Symmetry: D2
Subunit: 334 residues, 4 copies
């Protein structure tokens, strides 16, 4: 691309040790569910207030290399008139943009999906770049079952990610490739390992067929864990299976892997990331975080209303930011 050098610089930067990505890219719908989750009306006034609370948290932006925004938020102003994107860039945080248009179910499968949003994506990306966005997000969802994920599901999601990745790079956004394997079910960690290995290898083959510049991409995978209905397992076990799965599939050329939290609690996500960064083994990428819920849940709770609870919630948000920052360095302690 004409953006090759800037894609490569920004993707490397996202992976800076001690930093990760906040996912604040919840739709008007999803952020509603979260806003109701603590008895708050889903009005733009409140959507604005929640995101502003996060971004004006005293020690927080230094812990973040990136923030994923929803379209609305990319053009939104803080209360003092400052555009959020300026607020982010002042602190050295790259603004990112969710570009996928949700999932739809594949006929002839058992509730497996493919992700939409290729239509007019190049012109959207260009407009987002002009607005200050420098990376993009697109989520593919795959499930684990008797015959899942199917060859059709894998293929659709891999090549859908690969085509999205190309359009992103043509328009100056570093694509986060996010093939999330859902944790839901009763499978063991070994099964999650095999499936994760299969999916990533299909994804990197797809990315190669599409001539994607790997040094200008990011990966946002699931950690390798037992299913949501299976026994929890220690961080050192998650670490060992996750890192081995990535060693088997993700080229060195990729600069950074920013884990999604999935089912995990705030503390579990942090402890799991931390253990991966304590593992003495070849890891030719930054292992960092791209958390929404695992970074925000305690902050939403403390907040609820406003005023006295802003300062206490900003304290709570800083705790999680600083903990995950520590986790990227293998230096988190309880």
């Amino acid at each position: 691309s004409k953006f090759a050098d800037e894609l490569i610089a920004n993707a490397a930067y996202i992976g800076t040790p001690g930093k990760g990505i906040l996912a604040a890219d919840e739709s008007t719908g999803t952020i509603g569910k979260r806003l109701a989750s603590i008895n708050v009306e889903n009005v733009e006034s409140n959507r604005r207030a929640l995101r502003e609370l996060l971004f004006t948290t005293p020690g927080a932006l230094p812990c973040l290399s990136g923030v994923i925004l929803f379209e609305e938020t990319l053009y939104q102003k803080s209360s003092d008139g400052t555009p959020f994107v300026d607020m982010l860039k002042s602190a050295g945080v790259l603004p990112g943009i969710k570009v996928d248009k949700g999932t739809v179910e594949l006929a002839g499968t058992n509730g497996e999906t493919t992700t939409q949003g290729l239509d007019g994506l190049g012109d959207r990306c260009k407009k987002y770049y002009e607005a200050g966005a420098r990376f993009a997000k697109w989520r593919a969802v795959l499930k684990i079952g008797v015959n899942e994920p199917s060859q059709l599901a894998i293929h659709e999601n891999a090549y859908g990610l690969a085509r999205y990745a190309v359009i992103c790079q043509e328009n100056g956004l570093v694509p986060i490739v996010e093939p999330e394997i859902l944790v839901d079910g009763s499978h063991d960690i070994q099964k999650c390992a095999a499936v994760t290995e299969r999916v990533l290898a299909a994804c990197y083959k797809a990315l190669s067929d599409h001539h994607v510049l790997l040094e200008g991409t990011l990966l946002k995978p699931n950690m390798v864990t037992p299913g949501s209905e299976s026994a929890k397992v220690a961080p050192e076990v998650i670490a060992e299976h996750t890192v081995r799965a990535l060693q088997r599939t993700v080229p060195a050329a990729v600069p950074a892997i920013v884990f999604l939290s999935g089912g995990q609690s705030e503390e579990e996500a942090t402890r799991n990331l931390n253990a991966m960064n304590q593992l003495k083994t070849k890891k030719p990428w930054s292992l960092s975080f791209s958390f929404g819920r695992a970074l925000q849940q305690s902050t939403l709770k403390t907040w609820g209303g406003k005023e006295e609870n802003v300062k206490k919630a900003q304290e709570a948000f800083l705790v999680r930011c600083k903990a995950n920052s520590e986790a990227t360095l293998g230096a988190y302690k309880g």
Copy 2:
């Protein structure tokens, strides 16, 4: 994947291929029909777009030659001048309304101007709304070119799987999908090369359709005929027939009921003669060989029409000629003109 429309998809796809009938492609965009409308000094206003299509559809004796008409979005909701909805006009004559659903092409990075086709986003809800509007089949055009290194494996793959996913969403919402992998004529290659490329592309298309669990008996194919490139010597209909049918024999399952050829670069008479010769070829052909012609059905009608509505009756005479000729061509019974 059974669709809830399986029975109606199968019946309608079979119907399109009724011997003695074919498809009029009147689905050209606001842009393309402009180029055609300017081509005879006519301003591209919806009043004129409406008038051209009305002229075609109200041609006495024409609709009986047509199993289907592909419409552009605008035309699907358009009324004739007398207040008759075009879709009603079509259904009264037994013609199935169809709908172009693709959203154009875009270039693939890292290739030499090869394209992929857009339009999967929100296609299911569009298809459903089109079904409610009277449409019973759909069209999506993938474009492939012939070159030194073309079509590339990436171009083939993107277009095949894009067609396959489109085909599924169509069937889920009750539209028979026309699968249209057009290989463009541009270049200096011979007919043998066009044969090899067409064989490669169709085989990739039917593999993709299988991986997507598409009901083949509820689909249609709209391929290019096999021809020499645009810069090469034109060749007789018997030769086009022999290479085209052999290419289809090698790739298109019997389960597919009808193959409705696109005209592409061809003149009206050349298209008809080519189709006719395919239906005179004594060989296993487990599908109807018919037509889905835009240019090759409309060119002489646009010429005689020109502008004012006292050229209408002479142009409707000219449109009937081409309809009747192509009808004859589906039966191997066309006798020159």
Copy 3:
């Protein structure tokens, strides 16, 4: 890829599918024919292997029912008791000699007992030597199973591409390749499942054959009929016919001249009745539907034969019955027995 044998491959593959004829599969290994020879208390010596095959080939009135006989290596160079080379015996009656060329199956690591087929190494020189010996077609058996997660994508791929490479080497050396993706009956699945799996496998096979540039008009297909699993209720011939032919309609190009069904688990009468019903089904079938039967042609002949050569004439009577019945079956003209 044009072979220097293209014309002869096309003629011979077409011939195999002559209405009223089919293939005897007498290509069972030294091991398998042992199991059959023990099955009636006969020592597996080459003298007896020779005697069984001689009995078949010298059956008065049998060879006219056969377009082809598949031979094992040993049998291709064997002489009858009167000094007549079997291959000459076959060619005098217009029967093409064929040759099994695969070297058995081996299990795939990381699967649940799925196999891939061996024999590509040195196959071209073997094929050439077999052609020189009088063979004009070849056989290679891939085995796929139906299970919870079977057949796996790896099993399909390995067997499809193994068939495709084999097919090419065959054609380069003048043998029409019989492509034989046998899906085994074992299990409790219903006929619908067998249909879906058979559709998947054949589509992968024809994709592989296309990628390898195989001349389809110079190939044959030897698939399983579509049936319920071995543990499920047997079903009427009309039902086998309808699911089998639909599966073939969805996958096998018209360019393929003949589909010669393997018998698999089926009894003699069941095989014949099943084939017969397929030829009574009024539908697009752009290939000969015929037979390539081993077990289903030989079982009752082995029984009446048993041992000593005064059971020969009664067994040759029994072999003629099955030959004539299957011949009738290719024409849809079998009338029970």
Copy 4:
């Protein structure tokens, strides 16, 4: 496999810094061409003598983690009655075994090949393991042209390597996967980079579909170079394009990459390897050597006859061994 742990240990060992692989696996035919190349009759007496000269070279076996043998040589004795395989194991060198049965041309391509040898390979491998072999070699050949390598050539060679790899591991031999892209032609280094990237990515996708244990494999690729008819280029340029190509395609899980020399002279091979080991960049595998001709050519010349020329040729063989050893550490100087 039942050999998983030993495959992983031996593959890691081949990549020991300061060591590489001698390819002495020339057929009765090929070693003839080499033996005639210096006016020597191709008799077993002489075949025996040449290999013995190499293996009894004073400082040489310590420079080698592996020696690839032909079948004949695996059972051959030295002149003093010592089995070569014992001679190798005493010095800590793993015996390896060429298992492919040559190439054949693919119909409908322009002289592209596929490699034979899957038939009865498991029983061969088992017998070779029993004989002391602990790794295996199989060579796929791909060419660069207008339409080459073709999708058919890539596929056949990738999946042929993947199936060979599996059988090897089932029987305790670490498979060297060798997709050599021939240097022949007028293409530039950028073209060789693109083709090498395409081929390796197809190979690792094939290996994943076949469930190959990557930690128990080796890769033997071409270095990335301009074609044989193009201008030679400096080692630092070969290094930069080669390593980038490997970063884009070869998983970290693979322990070692042992380069084939291809067209290169003895000194050019060494200088090129050396430069790759001087490159400061993520390289999650050993970069070492698997040289036949680039290790042997000067030794064959000095030798010719025997006697006075043995000791001078052993001096010449030690020079090349020590130089390539230095090259694996980035410590070679002229």
